[PDB]
Amino acid sequence: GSSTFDALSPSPAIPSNTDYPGPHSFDVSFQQSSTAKSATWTYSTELKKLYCQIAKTCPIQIKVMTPPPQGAVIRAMPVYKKAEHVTEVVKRCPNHELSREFNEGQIAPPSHLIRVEGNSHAQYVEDPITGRQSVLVPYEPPQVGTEFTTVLYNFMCNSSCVGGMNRRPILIIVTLETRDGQVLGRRCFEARICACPGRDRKADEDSIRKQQVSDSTKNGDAFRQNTHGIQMT
Numbered sequence: 001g002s003s004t005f006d007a008l009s010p011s012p013a014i015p016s017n018t019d020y021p022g023p024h025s026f027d028v029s030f031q032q033s034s035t036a037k038s039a040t041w042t043y044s045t046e047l048k049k050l051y052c053q054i055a056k057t058c059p060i061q062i063k064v065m066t067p068p069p070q071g072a073v074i075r076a077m078p079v080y081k082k083a084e085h086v087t088e089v090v091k092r093c094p095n096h097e098l099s100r101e102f103n104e105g106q107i108a109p110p111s112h113l114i115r116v117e118g119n120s121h122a123q124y125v126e127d128p129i130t131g132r133q134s135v136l137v138p139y140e141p142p143q144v145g146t147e148f149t150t151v152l153y154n155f156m157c158n159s160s161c162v163g164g165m166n167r168r169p170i171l172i173i174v175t176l177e178t179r180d181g182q183v184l185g186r187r188c189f190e191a192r193i194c195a196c197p198g199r200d201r202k203a204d205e206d207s208i209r210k211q212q213v214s215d216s217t218k219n220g221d222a223f224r225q226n227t228h229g230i231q232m233t
């Protein structure tokens with residue numbers, strides 16, 4: 001066919017990051033830790049965003065009110081943030097793709113930007129039409145002693161290597177789906193790979209504190225309550 005897609009029709013599919021708890025209240029969250037140095041990954045709740053370093057483990061937790069159906073699988077796919085880029089597939093760099101896959105005895109070949117750790121049944125699929133890559137795994141019951149489930153993700157490229165992330169921030173969408181292809185719940189988060197995930201998390205927080213000024217509690221109340229004078233030059 002000469003049309004070779006990318007022309008009039010069919011139009012490329014555009015995934016949406018719209019949250020939808022659904023019946024089982026499917027939610028996503030990332031455990032919090034002190035601002036330690038060389039942190040593999042750190043998350044800020046105020047901004048709903050995660051910073052990670054390449055090849056480091058980022059455990060993520062799913063929270064639901066009642067365990068999903070048996071046979072259900074969890075999906076995770078990377079896509080660009082703005083629509084102008086979400087129609088373009090995210091791929092590997094020329095330098096980092098050239099490296100040998102070393103797939104012998106490995107569950108996650110480098111060919112996929114996102115990989116799973118700690119599940120021998122992790123497998124990857126390719127979108128037949130729009131190229132997108134994604135990885136899937138069977139949902140297991142919540143860990144013993146708590147009500148949530150843990151999945152370990154790994155990234156094989158970093159934001160600033162040309163030909164993959166190419167300085168373009170992206171979003172990751174994680175969904176709970178039934179064996180018959182029906183969606184139960186969808187949640188999404190924003191991801192960045194950087195040299196110091198600890199440093200970027202602190203920086204955005206400092207930007208908010210500067211904008212917000214707190215009133216000292218030395219006095220129970222102001223007698224004059226006058227707003228005279230300049231607040232910010």
Ligand SMILES: [Zn+2]
Pocket residue numbers: 092093096156157158161162163164165
């Ligand atoms: Zn790369």
